[PDB]
């Protein structure tokens, strides 16, 4: 016997699930594979950085954008596509000149702020980052060899006593050690990296931004505030001082755990054992979940503070950079946030040992004892938020459709206004006690209106429901009342049969699949809020309390330039935006059939098609189907493929709209 066509999907669904590998027999192999994969991924990141730097160096106009950044537009890379018109000139080129694309990433402001002035510096930087990619791959090879050499040194290893087998658990102490990793991460990788970047700023960035000054004196460490007037960005001296302070704090903190000597520092196990934790820190899924849950606030605050307090030169002067960066980082942090819950569920399925029935000692145990209370209260708050946001929006829509704008229910956002007032009083007290006052903070505090209150309630509803689905999946991954053996099965499995009431979407993976739709919807709400307030603050402040305003004055109204891109009147430089808009609509709708239509129909359809192929004159004498038997996609594969189509469509439909509306 052999396999069917579903082998490809089955293999690719766990192609990186190194725990599911067949040759892997021990944590040594798993940890070494993960470490080597980390090295390869770092190489990929470095090559990507070098790629962007090269294309800015070669197929771009950094040397000219740096001179007049406010009205100029950067170039991403050239367009070489043989499908364009070999005659005339495309709307993306100045007549006979080559074809170009406008960069919406923001690397131009990054390099300008960091101190780049010439193309030659960018070329040297590209070369150095390619060198670093080589170094990373060679480090991967080095560590593979060192661990294989330890394994070979077990050919000259014996304790002369039966305790020699204890060495089995310490072979991967290089990777699995936690105290040393925490100490050196928090100290070196955070604090000293910040201190080195402060040195970079003081040596290059501040010297290459103003007239020549003293030999990088300590007057380069200022405490001004935000939004230097000329470049509309944070003071580079303030940034250097901030990185210096963070570096000092994290360097001091990095001396906490017992890393290299047994006589200094406290152990993480003893820290947890005397607190409300003591979790299984040897689980890789648990660590991954709680560090993905750490990159999530970091990325969300990155999205918030790149816009609110623009740190790069002339970044606020670009109407497309500011929206694209915020939306990108919001989507990245939403993905990481749902990742944290997905891997928490995988941790509970795979890497969690629980007491017999009643020992309420582990934190997961105490959570599982009253998990029903958690889920019931999360459902209650989700229901309240949904009911009272949709109902008030419906009131506003109905009363404004009935020619009565004054009959709306507009709750003044008093709590957010109080927080803003307190923060503004603090900031104004800071500013008034300065001999160099009249500072600006850009959008750190923004006008808050009833529309803001309603949108914040909608966002809270989305977050609550996403957390509800993910938390329910995590807590009932090991067993629910409907299926009280769920931890005997895989993390993702089809169903439990039509009996016992019917059990579609019962696995924890199915809970993740359901929660990804809500993650996408909440992110869409957040992005729509930001983009609408960005396009017209006045119209958002007044007419955003009724959903018809969102439907008309934002979606229908702002989609005018994009659809007009390519038509029977000529093309604009938004032609790619409109074409990708339609393509992403097609991708989004194509995944509906993988979600709505389920397997058996298609399996019968595939049986009919296979009947045809085994009935066609020439095919039957070459291919009997016994080798790679065509079969319909399995249930979990179908749900995942539909989810991928839906996610791709929903995500990639937005950047064309952003570019058409802002540019």
């Amino acid at each position: 016997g052999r396999c069917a066509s579903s082998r490809y999907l089955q293999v690719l669904g766990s192609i990186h699930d190194i725990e599911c590998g067949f040759g892997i027999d021990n944590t040594l192999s798993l940890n070494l594979q993960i470490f080597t994969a980390h090295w390869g991924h770092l190489t990929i990141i470095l090559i990507w950085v070098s790629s962007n730097l090269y294309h800015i160096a070669s197929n771009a106009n950094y040397s000219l954008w740096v001179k007049n950044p406010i009205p100029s537009m950067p170039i991403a890379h050239n367009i070489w596509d043989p499908h364009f018109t070999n005659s005339t000139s495309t709307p993306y080129s100045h007549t006979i000149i080559t074809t170009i694309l406008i960069a919406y990433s923001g690397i131009y402001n990054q390099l300008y702020t960091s101190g780049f002035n010439t193309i030659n510096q960018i070329y040297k930087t590209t070369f150095t980052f390619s060198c670093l990619a080589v170094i990373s791959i060679l480090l991967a090879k080095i560590h593979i060899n060192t661990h294989s050499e330890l394994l070979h040194k077990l050919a000259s290893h014996t304790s002369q006593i039966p305790s020699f087998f204890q060495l089995l658990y310490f072979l991967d102490v290089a990777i699995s050690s936690v105290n040393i990793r925490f100490n050196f991460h928090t100290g070196i990788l955070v604090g000293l990296f910040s201190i080195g970047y402060t040195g970079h700023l003081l040596d290059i960035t501040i010297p290459a931004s103003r007239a020549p000054l003293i030999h990088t004196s300590p007057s380069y460490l200022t405490f001004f505030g935000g939004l230097k007037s000329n470049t509309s960005s944070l003071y580079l001296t303030d940034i250097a001082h901030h990185h210096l302070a963070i570096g000092i704090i994290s360097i001091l903190t990095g001396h906490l755990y017992s890393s290299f000597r047994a006589a200094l520092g406290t152990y993480i196990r003893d820290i947890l054992y005397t607190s409300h934790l003591t979790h299984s820190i040897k689980s890789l899924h648990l660590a991954l979940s709680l560090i993905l849950a750490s990159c999530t606030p970091l990325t969300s605050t990155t999205a918030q503070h790149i816009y609110s307090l623009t740190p790069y030169f002339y970044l606020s002067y670009d109407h497309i950079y500011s929206t694209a960066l915020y939306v990108h980082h919001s989507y990245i942090t939403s993905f990481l946030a749902i990742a944290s819950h997905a891997h928490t569920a995988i941790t509970l399925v795979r890497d969690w040992v629980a007491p017999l029935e009643q020992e309420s000692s582990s934190k997961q145990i105490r959570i599982h004892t009253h998990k029903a209370a958690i889920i019931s209260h999360l459902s209650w708050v989700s229901l309240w938020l949904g009911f009272h946001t949709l109902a008030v929006y419906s009131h506003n829509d109905t009363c404004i459709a009935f020619n009565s704008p004054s009959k709306q229910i507009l709750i003044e956002a008093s709590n957010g206004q109080l927080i803003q007032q307190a923060s503004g009083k603090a900031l104004y007290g800071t500013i008034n006690s300065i001999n160099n006052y009249n500072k600006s903070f850009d959008s750190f505090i923004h006008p808050i209106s009833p529309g803001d209150l309603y949108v914040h309630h909608a966002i809270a509803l989305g977050l609550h429901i996403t957390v509800l689905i993910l938390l329910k999946g995590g807590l009932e991954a090991r067993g629910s009342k409907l299926m009280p053996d769920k931890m005997e099965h895989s993390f993702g499995f089809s169903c439990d049969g039509p009996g016992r009431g019917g059990t579609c979407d019962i696995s924890a993976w199915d809970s993740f699949y359901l929660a990804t739709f809500w993650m996408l919807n909440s992110n869409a709400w957040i992005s729509f809020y930001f983009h609408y307030k960005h396009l017209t603050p006045r119209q958002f402040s007044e007419s955003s309390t009724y959903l018809e305003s969102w439907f008309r004055d934002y979606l229908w109204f702002n989609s005018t330039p994009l659809i007009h891109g390519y038509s029977t009147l000529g093309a604009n430089d938004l032609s790619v935006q409109s074409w990708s808009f339609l393509l992403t609509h097609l991708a989004w709708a194509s995944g509906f059939m993988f979600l709505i239509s389920w397997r058996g129909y298609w399996q019968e359809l595939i049986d009919i098609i296979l009947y045809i192929h085994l009935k066609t004159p020439i095919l039957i004498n070459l291919w009997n189907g016994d080798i790679y038997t065509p079969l319909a996609l399995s249930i979990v594969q179908a749900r995942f493929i539909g989810l991928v189509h839906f996610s791709t469509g929903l995500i990639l439909t937005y950047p064309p709209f952003i570019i058409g509306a802002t540019s």
Binding site: S163, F165, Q166, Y169, V178, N179, F223, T266, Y267, I268, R269, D270, Y273, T274, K282, V353, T430, S433, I434, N435
Partner: protein, 131 residues
């Protein structure tokens, strides 16, 4: 005699009661019994008798309860003085804004408040153990 289900359950209970006691001993050697795993470090028991042992406070395990109480109250006074003399009374912000420097004594002292909190925690832990 035939092995009734009650007899099988009795064997289950006997086996579990014996083995759960045996595995705690020095003769099972499971990876969950390593240092940094569930069991306490050899010479440093953290929790015994449902009370924080003296080894919790690390290098302060040899300190007396009276010494820790005095250090806790002294550090609380000094740190609270530093915080109040840095924030509200004798503000340093205007002085440092015009090119001056912080009163370094205030900065050093203000870090003694959380130190005092944990010092009084350690004082209570020492008092519980009779040290």
């Amino acid at each position: 005699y035939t092995e009734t289900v009650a007899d099988e359950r009795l064997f289950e209970q006997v086996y579990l009661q014996y083995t759960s006691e045996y595995l705690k001993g020095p003769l099972y050697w499971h990876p969950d019994k390593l240092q940094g795993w569930l069991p306490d470090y050899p010479g440093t028991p953290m929790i015994k008798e449902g009370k924080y042992t003296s080894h919790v406070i690390g290098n302060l395990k040899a300190f007396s309860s009276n010494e820790l109480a005095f250090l806790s109250m002294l550090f609380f006074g000094v740190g609270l003085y530093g915080n109040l003399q840095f924030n509200f009374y004798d503000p340093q912000w205007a002085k440092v804004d015009a090119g001056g420097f912080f009163n370094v004594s205030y900065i050093v002292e203000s870090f003694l408040l959380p130190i005092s909190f944990f010092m009084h925690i350690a004082c209570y832990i020492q008092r519980q153990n009779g040290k």
